[PDB]
Amino acid sequence: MRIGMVCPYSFDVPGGVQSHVLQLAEVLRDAGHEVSVLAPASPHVKLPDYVVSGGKAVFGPATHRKVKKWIAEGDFDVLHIHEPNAPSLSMLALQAAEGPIVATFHTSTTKSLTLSVFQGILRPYHEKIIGRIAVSDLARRWQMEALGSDAVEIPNGVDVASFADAPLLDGYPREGRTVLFLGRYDEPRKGMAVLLAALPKLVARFPDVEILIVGRGDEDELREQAGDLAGHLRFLGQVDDATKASAMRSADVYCAPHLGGESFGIVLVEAMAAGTAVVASDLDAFRRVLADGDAGRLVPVDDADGMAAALIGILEDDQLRAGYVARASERVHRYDWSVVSAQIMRVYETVSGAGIKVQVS
Numbered sequence: 001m002r003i004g005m006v007c008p009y010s011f012d013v014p015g016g017v018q019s020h021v022l023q024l025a026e027v028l029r030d031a032g033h034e035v036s037v038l039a040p041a042s043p044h045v046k047l048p049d050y051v052v053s054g055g056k057a058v059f060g061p062a063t064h065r066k067v068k069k070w071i072a073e074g075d076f077d078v079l080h081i082h083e084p085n086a087p088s089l090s091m092l093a094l095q096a097a098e099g100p101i102v103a104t105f106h107t108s109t110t111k112s113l114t115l116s117v118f119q120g121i122l123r124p125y126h127e128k129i130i131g132r133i134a135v136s137d138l139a140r141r142w143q144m145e146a147l148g149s150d151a152v153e154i155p156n157g158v159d160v161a162s163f164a165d166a167p168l169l170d171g172y173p174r175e176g177r178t179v180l181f182l183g184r185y186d187e188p189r190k191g192m193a194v195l196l197a198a199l200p201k202l203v204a205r206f207p208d209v210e211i212l213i214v215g216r217g218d219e220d221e222l223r224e225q226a227g228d229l230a231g232h233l234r235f236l237g238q239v240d241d242a243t244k245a246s247a248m249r250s251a252d253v254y255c256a257p258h259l260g261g262e263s264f265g266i267v268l269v270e271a272m273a274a275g276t277a278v279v280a281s282d283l284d285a286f287r288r289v290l291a292d293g294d295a296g297r298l299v300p301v302d303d304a305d306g307m308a309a310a311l312i313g314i315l316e317d318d319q320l321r322a323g324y325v326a327r328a329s330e331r332v333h334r335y336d337w338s339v340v341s342a343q344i345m346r347v348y349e350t351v352s353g354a355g356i357k358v359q360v361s
C-alpha cells in the first residue's frame, strides 16, 4: 500500500495530532508500505523526506495548487486525513480528493457540536469520508448518530518500549521525590494553576520535592507565582522525545491536572508506558485511560486540595504505587503501536481495493 496522510498542524510545535501522524507513518513504513505526509510549512525541524509542505497559512492559492498536485500525482491507495475542521489543510484535502478516504477525529466536545458540524454545510465533504476513526466510544457513537453510518474507535498509539527502556536522567530518581508535569503550562486548561495551588501542601510533606516541568511557557510568570516555592520547580524546556521519555521514567508521579479540552489522555498513556504512577484530573477521557481508577489515581476536577492529598498519598505509600505501576504497565499494551496500527490497517483495507486510487475532484 501507498498511504497519503494529511496533518493540519505544523510540525514546528509538539502536539497530539502531529505526534500521531509522524509516528504512524514510520510504523506503516517499518511494515513495508509507502507513506506520504502532507502538513503546513514546518521551517524549524528535521523532517524525513516523505513529509511534504503545503505552504504556510496567512491558506493561499499555492496551497490549493499543492494539495491538488499532491493528490493527483500521489497514486494513493488511501488518503488518511486527521482532524478535518473547517478551515484547515485537512478540510482542503477532503474537498479536493475523491475515493478511499479515511479520517481520524482527534478532538470533540459534545454530541451537539458533532451532529451540527457533520449535519452542517460541510456535510457533502463529510459524507466522502469512507472510514471514520474516532478516539473514544462516545465520540464514535456521536458520529454514527450524526451521519447514520459506521464509525470505529481506535485509541491513538505510542511506542511503549521507547518509554519503558528510556534511560533515567542524570541524578534521578530523587531522594526528595519528584513530580512531573507535561504541557503548554500557560493555557489554563492544562491545569498548571491546580498543581500550583497544591504545591504548598506538597512541599510541607516532602521539603525536597521537585516539580519537573516539560513544555513551552513563560517561566518567569510561573516562578513569580510559586512565590516562596519557585526553587522547587525545574524547567526542562520543550525537550525532544528521547529526553521526555527519560524525564518521564525518572519521575515518581506524573501529574495531569487538566481542566478540560482533552479528548484522549495520551500523555497519561506515556506515563503508564514508562512505569511512572499517574495521578490525574478525572476528565471523561482520563478516566478511560486510568480505567475508572484501577490503573492510576483519579481526583475531582478543579480541586487543588484533593490533588495534594492525592500526590502525597501516592508518594509516601510505596505498595500503592507499585500496584498502580504494575496494573498500568499491564493495561498500557492496549495503546502500543502494534495493536493500534493493526486497527487502522483494517480500516485502510475495508476502504481500499485494487485499481481504486484517490483522485482530484
Ligand SMILES: Nc1nc2c(ncn2[C@@H]2O[C@H](COP(=O)(O)OP(=O)(O)O[C@H]3O[C@H](CO)[C@@H](O)[C@H](O)[C@@H]3O)[C@@H](O)[C@H]2O)c(=O)[nH]1
Residues within 6 Å of the ligand: 014, 015, 016, 017, 019, 106, 107, 108, 182, 183, 184, 214, 215, 216, 237, 238, 239, 240, 241, 242, 244, 261, 262, 263, 264, 265, 266, 267, 270, 285
Ligand atoms: N518531546 C516533547 N513532546 C511533547 C511536548 N509537549 C507535548 N508533547 C507530546 O505532545 C503530545 C500531545 O500532548 P499534549 O501537548 O498535552 O496534547 P495536545 O496536543 O495539547 O492535545 C491533543 O492531544 C491530547 C493528548 O491525547 C488530547 O487529549 C487532545 O484532545 C488533543 O487531541 C504528547 O504525545 C506529548 O508527549 C514537549 O515539550 N516535548
